[PDB]
Amino acid sequence: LNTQTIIDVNKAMDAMLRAYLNQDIAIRFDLPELDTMQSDAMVSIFLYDIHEDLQLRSAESRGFDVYAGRLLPGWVNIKCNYLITYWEASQPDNQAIQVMSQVLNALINNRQLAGIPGAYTQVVPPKESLNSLGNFWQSLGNRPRLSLNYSVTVPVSLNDGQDSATPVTAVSSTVEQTASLSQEVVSHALRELLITELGGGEDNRLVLSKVELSAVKETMTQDMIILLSVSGITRQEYLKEIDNIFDRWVNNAEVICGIRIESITKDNLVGI
Amino acid sequence: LNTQTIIDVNKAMDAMLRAYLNQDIAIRFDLPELDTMQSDAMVSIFLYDIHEDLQLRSAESRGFDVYAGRLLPGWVNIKCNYLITYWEASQPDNQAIQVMSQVLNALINNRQLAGIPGAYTQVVPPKESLNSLGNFWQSLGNRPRLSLNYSVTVPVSLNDGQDSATPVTAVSSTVEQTASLSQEVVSHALRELLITELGGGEDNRLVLSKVELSAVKETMTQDMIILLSVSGITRQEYLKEIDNIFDRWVNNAEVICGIRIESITKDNLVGI
Amino acid sequence: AVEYPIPVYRFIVSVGDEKIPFNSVSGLDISYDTIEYRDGVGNWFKMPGQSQSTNITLRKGVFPGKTELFDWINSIQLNQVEKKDITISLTNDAGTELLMTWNVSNAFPTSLTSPSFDATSNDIAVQEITLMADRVIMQA
Amino acid sequence: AVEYPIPVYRFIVSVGDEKIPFNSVSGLDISYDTIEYRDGVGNWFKMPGQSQSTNITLRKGVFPGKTELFDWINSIQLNQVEKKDITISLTNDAGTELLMTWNVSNAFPTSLTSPSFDATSNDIAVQEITLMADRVIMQA
Amino acid sequence: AVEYPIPVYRFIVSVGDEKIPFNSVSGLDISYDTIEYRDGVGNWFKMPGQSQSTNITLRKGVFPGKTELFDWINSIQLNQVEKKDITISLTNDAGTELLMTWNVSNAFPTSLTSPSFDATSNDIAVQEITLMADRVIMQA
Amino acid sequence: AVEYPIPVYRFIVSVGDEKIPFNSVSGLDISYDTIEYRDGVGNWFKMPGQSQSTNITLRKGVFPGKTELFDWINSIQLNQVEKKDITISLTNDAGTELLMTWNVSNAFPTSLTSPSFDATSNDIAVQEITLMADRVIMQA
């Protein structure tokens, strides 16, 4: 029940199936060619489609190994469908029945796969009809025959080791009294200053309508230092004057609960 | 997560897949021919159908760039489905498994595509059956094999730059008192004049039944100038007389809240 | 002139003052109740009565790091919620004109449903929100 | 003579005085209630009683710049709505004759449903409207 | 920038303090009731009223020898059940970040449904459990 | 370790003291009711109340000459019916261990439905029986 690879479930086909089969039946893991002058009596374990099964998935966080400071990769749950036929070079005791019966007694006996336990498998499921098998028998050169299919779901792992995080060492918390004014009360007082510093009016408020003033502040007097970040759009005319306004507005004797303006005056607005 | 092109998602197949594959496996982006005397061991990344996915779409307005006065093109969200097989020129450790396992460890590891992040991708989905794969194996000359499919959805952009609009400069509104009479009260008074100017009666109202009089007016006296536009159908007889009626009805001493008729007497009616 | 009807995949929904991408908008029907007064003599009076309430349930894909719909419904204290107009309008595919425009006046969201997480699917996370408003009229 | 029944794709709906293209017309059924008076002796009396109300829900594709159905339902103030006759009639495919004609007298629209915008489809915008009227009779 | 919506197959559900694999989480909707006060003069008042209750039904595959969900619901005597917070959050597929996070405060399980054993299927044993809690808010 | 969930086709149902082959077992849910007490000040109290009743409907193929389910329900006179425990438990496919075990204490059958004979099918005769019991707990 560790994390597997598609070769590790393909090698577990041969060790499962050759313990029940005869000793002199060759096992080829590819569907043979059309002419195929070959050794007689091959059992062709063909892997026709592999896809991840949505039914078995779940909500998994990447696990944390502590002794290395590393995050675990994770799994995909890929399902591998097989197709087991019997090829050659007229009785109730057929030759092709005796080999397919030896395969069938190996498939239903290994409901959980013995070389790889914990893999969720479906043995010989009713997946077929005559219409679906009609398109399959046409594919391998118009030769109808018996076919057993058997599907294993094994987890495949991703590959990374660079995603690393340190374990949590110390938890420290520091409760504090928040001031009476907030970020919202300050942002009205800065813009209504900037409307008034420009000269007020309605025609000056609409050109400054798409500019917000957001403050990150540290109140250090306890009887306060506030700095902002400016972003938006404004017209070509008042770009020069407003950039002249908050130029002088920072470096002053802090005369404007006081508004003590300091270094960061971040600009994201480009005037149009 | 910028806007892409179908070649930019096709080039991101090769840079994704060749970092996990062997160095000496050729990667052809077309399904090979039937005979194909070729270099051995090609991995054929085949793009079989591309179509826009309706699931990912949304309600988007064309964005507006301000510094250029230009409207943005927009995106289509086209989905590109692939099909990754393995071609050649008998063990559990097959040669074809070792290359398809190296492709599969590249597909499930790149759930979001590394060369092009933000593309919404589906890896190895359960899209198939034996009936659907039966019609595919018939298509490439009756040779069944393994196939992995992997679908990327990337936005493709339209191409225009002529759709241009200017940013809104000034908002000016002018409230005003609307007069006591409306467009509906005037339109009764014009037609009932025109019935009376023709001579009245029921037989004169039915021939003028399919004619409407709609007025666009400017009330300039404040103790009014009104002009109309005429449209409809009328019979061959009264076409000459009514065109004689609103001939003299415009150029007069404005004797008919007064009805001061002026220049525009737009005609859309052609008499029958 | 044949003038085929416009398809439904092209529309713009502008909530408040900002345009946001919605996956679907449903409902928004003008409705009325009927009043019947059957006489004794035999005639029948059928009049339209009180205006029935208007209910709009519109969806949206979950976008990484953008909270528009939650910050609307989080502001609901006892009954004081900000109300904003919704304008749903169909365009032509050039994107310039508005062919037919609905506006929904004074909308406030009752409920929003978080996306149904089903980890056996490859589908996209979509979250409904159910507005409720009055006086839906169509423009031209 | 075999006289096959006429298909449903050819019909004309004329609302008021102007003909307008409707995608579908449903309902328009004459209906009655039944009155039973079971005797004590044992016989049974089954008579048709009061006329049940008639409800018509007919659709229409959304057309660019043409507002017929909204300017009907916008005129509804308290109960004073203009009422106009609806004539639904099947034709022959030459388009000249009317084979079988329904008329619906004094129809007024209760509700119209705006088109369900689903931006994951290639379908066309269709808007229902639900009239309600009395005295539906069939002509010939 | 196009910014496609994140799919629903990647999420983390952490019940209490331990993370456990859930197959599906449904519901978890903020909801409100509406209050209408129709005036005599004619205007309409639509306000959001009392907060509707929040109900969450989330599934889980049956795992061999691990009893998390039963030892929660077994502790219910008369009304004293331990309550623990549920945080459902979507990630990016690297698994490091949390893009959008719901938390469900003070959840207690009403019912859990044992897996419907149907011995004519090859399906996997899944067991629902129906929590019920208050004050579901979304973070960012 | 990945530890896939166990499928539902392997289980053992032992009614009373003898094991009998059942085709399907459904339901068997622990359930509770909720009690709400909304304060005047504004806080909310959500507690789990009375235990809801437990209902189990489990099927069985009709077997030739074996009457187990009828001789159970035939013994019901006025209210005196013998009650016997039901243990439904999932195994591993070797058949030795019990991974997860439900037991249903003091079960008595209300109803059993005879097989729906439909002579246009090739299906097998299956008969439900609906037990009703209390105190379903899960073991490990």
PDB file of C-alpha atoms in Angstrom, chain A residues 141-253:
ATOM      1  CA  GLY A 141      -7.702  -7.417 -38.143  1.00  0.00           C
ATOM      2  CA  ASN A 142     -11.183  -9.029 -38.087  1.00  0.00           C
ATOM      3  CA  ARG A 143     -10.377 -11.960 -35.791  1.00  0.00           C
ATOM      4  CA  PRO A 144     -12.959 -12.476 -33.023  1.00  0.00           C
ATOM      5  CA  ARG A 145     -11.851 -14.187 -29.829  1.00  0.00           C
ATOM      6  CA  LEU A 146     -12.342 -14.272 -26.066  1.00  0.00           C
ATOM      7  CA  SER A 147     -10.978 -11.496 -23.873  1.00  0.00           C
ATOM      8  CA  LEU A 148     -10.753 -10.956 -20.128  1.00  0.00           C
ATOM      9  CA  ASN A 149     -10.256  -7.476 -18.728  1.00  0.00           C
ATOM     10  CA  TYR A 150      -8.972  -6.624 -15.277  1.00  0.00           C
ATOM     11  CA  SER A 151      -8.357  -3.167 -13.859  1.00  0.00           C
ATOM     12  CA  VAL A 152      -5.985  -2.060 -11.092  1.00  0.00           C
ATOM     13  CA  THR A 153      -5.935   1.375  -9.430  1.00  0.00           C
ATOM     14  CA  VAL A 154      -2.535   2.278  -7.991  1.00  0.00           C
ATOM     15  CA  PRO A 155      -1.252   5.600  -6.593  1.00  0.00           C
ATOM     16  CA  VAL A 156       1.474   7.295  -8.637  1.00  0.00           C
ATOM     17  CA  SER A 157       3.632   9.922  -6.940  1.00  0.00           C
ATOM     18  CA  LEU A 158       4.689  13.379  -8.033  1.00  0.00           C
ATOM     19  CA  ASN A 159       8.365  14.345  -7.836  1.00  0.00           C
ATOM     20  CA  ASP A 160       9.548  17.363  -5.859  1.00  0.00           C
ATOM     21  CA  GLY A 161      11.525  17.994  -2.704  1.00  0.00           C
ATOM     22  CA  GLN A 162      12.108  21.735  -2.907  1.00  0.00           C
ATOM     23  CA  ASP A 163       8.821  22.723  -1.251  1.00  0.00           C
ATOM     24  CA  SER A 164      10.020  22.987   2.340  1.00  0.00           C
ATOM     25  CA  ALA A 165       8.687  24.610   5.491  1.00  0.00           C
ATOM     26  CA  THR A 166       9.966  24.718   9.000  1.00  0.00           C
ATOM     27  CA  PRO A 167       7.992  23.323  11.959  1.00  0.00           C
ATOM     28  CA  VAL A 168       6.231  25.818  14.200  1.00  0.00           C
ATOM     29  CA  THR A 169       8.573  26.642  17.060  1.00  0.00           C
ATOM     30  CA  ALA A 170       7.016  29.289  19.314  1.00  0.00           C
ATOM     31  CA  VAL A 171       3.545  30.816  19.486  1.00  0.00           C
ATOM     32  CA  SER A 172       3.617  34.416  20.719  1.00  0.00           C
ATOM     33  CA  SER A 173       0.594  36.734  20.743  1.00  0.00           C
ATOM     34  CA  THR A 174       0.389  40.391  21.779  1.00  0.00           C
ATOM     35  CA  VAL A 175      -3.014  41.904  22.522  1.00  0.00           C
ATOM     36  CA  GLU A 176      -3.233  45.686  22.355  1.00  0.00           C
ATOM     37  CA  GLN A 177      -5.698  48.552  22.530  1.00  0.00           C
ATOM     38  CA  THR A 178      -6.790  49.774  19.106  1.00  0.00           C
ATOM     39  CA  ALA A 179      -7.170  53.538  18.783  1.00  0.00           C
ATOM     40  CA  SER A 180     -10.506  55.336  18.520  1.00  0.00           C
ATOM     41  CA  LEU A 181      -9.934  56.313  14.883  1.00  0.00           C
ATOM     42  CA  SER A 182      -9.621  53.608  12.238  1.00  0.00           C
ATOM     43  CA  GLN A 183      -8.378  53.358   8.659  1.00  0.00           C
ATOM     44  CA  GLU A 184     -11.796  54.500   7.426  1.00  0.00           C
ATOM     45  CA  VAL A 185     -12.054  57.639   9.577  1.00  0.00           C
ATOM     46  CA  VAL A 186      -8.543  58.737   8.561  1.00  0.00           C
ATOM     47  CA  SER A 187      -9.189  58.201   4.826  1.00  0.00           C
ATOM     48  CA  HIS A 188     -12.088  60.660   4.863  1.00  0.00           C
ATOM     49  CA  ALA A 189      -9.979  63.241   6.694  1.00  0.00           C
ATOM     50  CA  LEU A 190      -7.114  63.009   4.202  1.00  0.00           C
ATOM     51  CA  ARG A 191      -9.228  63.346   1.058  1.00  0.00           C
ATOM     52  CA  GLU A 192     -11.355  66.160   2.499  1.00  0.00           C
ATOM     53  CA  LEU A 193      -8.079  67.883   3.313  1.00  0.00           C
ATOM     54  CA  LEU A 194      -6.885  67.288  -0.246  1.00  0.00           C
ATOM     55  CA  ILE A 195     -10.137  68.653  -1.676  1.00  0.00           C
ATOM     56  CA  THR A 196      -9.724  71.696   0.582  1.00  0.00           C
ATOM     57  CA  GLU A 197      -5.989  72.061  -0.141  1.00  0.00           C
ATOM     58  CA  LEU A 198      -6.763  72.122  -3.862  1.00  0.00           C
ATOM     59  CA  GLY A 199      -9.515  74.704  -3.301  1.00  0.00           C
ATOM     60  CA  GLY A 200     -12.728  72.705  -2.867  1.00  0.00           C
ATOM     61  CA  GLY A 201     -15.739  72.778  -5.140  1.00  0.00           C
ATOM     62  CA  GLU A 202     -17.590  70.184  -7.172  1.00  0.00           C
ATOM     63  CA  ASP A 203     -15.379  70.453 -10.274  1.00  0.00           C
ATOM     64  CA  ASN A 204     -12.319  69.633  -8.151  1.00  0.00           C
ATOM     65  CA  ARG A 205     -13.975  66.697  -6.403  1.00  0.00           C
ATOM     66  CA  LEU A 206     -14.886  64.879  -9.623  1.00  0.00           C
ATOM     67  CA  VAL A 207     -11.339  65.005 -11.001  1.00  0.00           C
ATOM     68  CA  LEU A 208     -10.169  63.536  -7.681  1.00  0.00           C
ATOM     69  CA  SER A 209     -13.037  61.034  -7.520  1.00  0.00           C
ATOM     70  CA  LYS A 210     -10.971  58.050  -8.696  1.00  0.00           C
ATOM     71  CA  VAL A 211      -8.159  58.497  -6.141  1.00  0.00           C
ATOM     72  CA  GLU A 212      -8.131  56.646  -2.820  1.00  0.00           C
ATOM     73  CA  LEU A 213      -5.911  57.364   0.182  1.00  0.00           C
ATOM     74  CA  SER A 214      -5.128  54.344   2.351  1.00  0.00           C
ATOM     75  CA  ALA A 215      -3.073  54.744   5.516  1.00  0.00           C
ATOM     76  CA  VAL A 216      -0.737  52.385   7.354  1.00  0.00           C
ATOM     77  CA  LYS A 217       0.000  54.095  10.647  1.00  0.00           C
ATOM     78  CA  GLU A 218       1.725  53.752  14.023  1.00  0.00           C
ATOM     79  CA  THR A 219       0.183  55.788  16.840  1.00  0.00           C
ATOM     80  CA  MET A 220       3.180  56.607  19.022  1.00  0.00           C
ATOM     81  CA  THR A 221       1.917  59.554  21.071  1.00  0.00           C
ATOM     82  CA  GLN A 222      -0.504  58.484  23.805  1.00  0.00           C
ATOM     83  CA  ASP A 223      -2.212  61.756  24.766  1.00  0.00           C
ATOM     84  CA  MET A 224      -0.126  60.270  15.900  1.00  0.00           C
ATOM     85  CA  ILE A 225       2.244  59.269  13.099  1.00  0.00           C
ATOM     86  CA  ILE A 226       0.332  58.323   9.928  1.00  0.00           C
ATOM     87  CA  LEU A 227       1.618  57.580   6.422  1.00  0.00           C
ATOM     88  CA  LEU A 228      -0.367  56.644   3.315  1.00  0.00           C
ATOM     89  CA  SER A 229      -0.251  55.056  -0.140  1.00  0.00           C
ATOM     90  CA  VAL A 230      -1.940  56.707  -3.126  1.00  0.00           C
ATOM     91  CA  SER A 231      -3.424  54.943  -6.148  1.00  0.00           C
ATOM     92  CA  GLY A 232      -5.863  55.694  -8.945  1.00  0.00           C
ATOM     93  CA  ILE A 233      -6.302  57.773 -12.098  1.00  0.00           C
ATOM     94  CA  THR A 234      -6.570  61.518 -12.589  1.00  0.00           C
ATOM     95  CA  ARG A 235      -6.577  63.901 -15.512  1.00  0.00           C
ATOM     96  CA  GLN A 236      -3.541  65.481 -17.169  1.00  0.00           C
ATOM     97  CA  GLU A 237      -4.129  68.936 -15.663  1.00  0.00           C
ATOM     98  CA  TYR A 238      -4.406  68.221 -11.934  1.00  0.00           C
ATOM     99  CA  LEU A 239      -1.666  65.577 -11.955  1.00  0.00           C
ATOM    100  CA  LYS A 240       1.000  68.281 -11.591  1.00  0.00           C
ATOM    101  CA  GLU A 241      -0.827  70.256  -8.897  1.00  0.00           C
ATOM    102  CA  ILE A 242      -1.775  67.303  -6.679  1.00  0.00           C
ATOM    103  CA  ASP A 243       1.787  65.965  -6.914  1.00  0.00           C
ATOM    104  CA  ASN A 244       2.755  69.463  -5.786  1.00  0.00           C
ATOM    105  CA  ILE A 245       0.210  69.260  -2.956  1.00  0.00           C
ATOM    106  CA  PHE A 246       1.328  66.037  -1.285  1.00  0.00           C
ATOM    107  CA  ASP A 247       4.919  67.063  -1.983  1.00  0.00           C
ATOM    108  CA  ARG A 248       4.823  69.851   0.613  1.00  0.00           C
ATOM    109  CA  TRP A 249       2.218  68.024   2.714  1.00  0.00           C
ATOM    110  CA  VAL A 250       4.742  65.429   3.912  1.00  0.00           C
ATOM    111  CA  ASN A 251       7.816  67.511   4.781  1.00  0.00           C
ATOM    112  CA  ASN A 252       6.258  70.055   7.140  1.00  0.00           C
ATOM    113  CA  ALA A 253       6.230  70.756  10.897  1.00  0.00           C
TER     114      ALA A 253
END
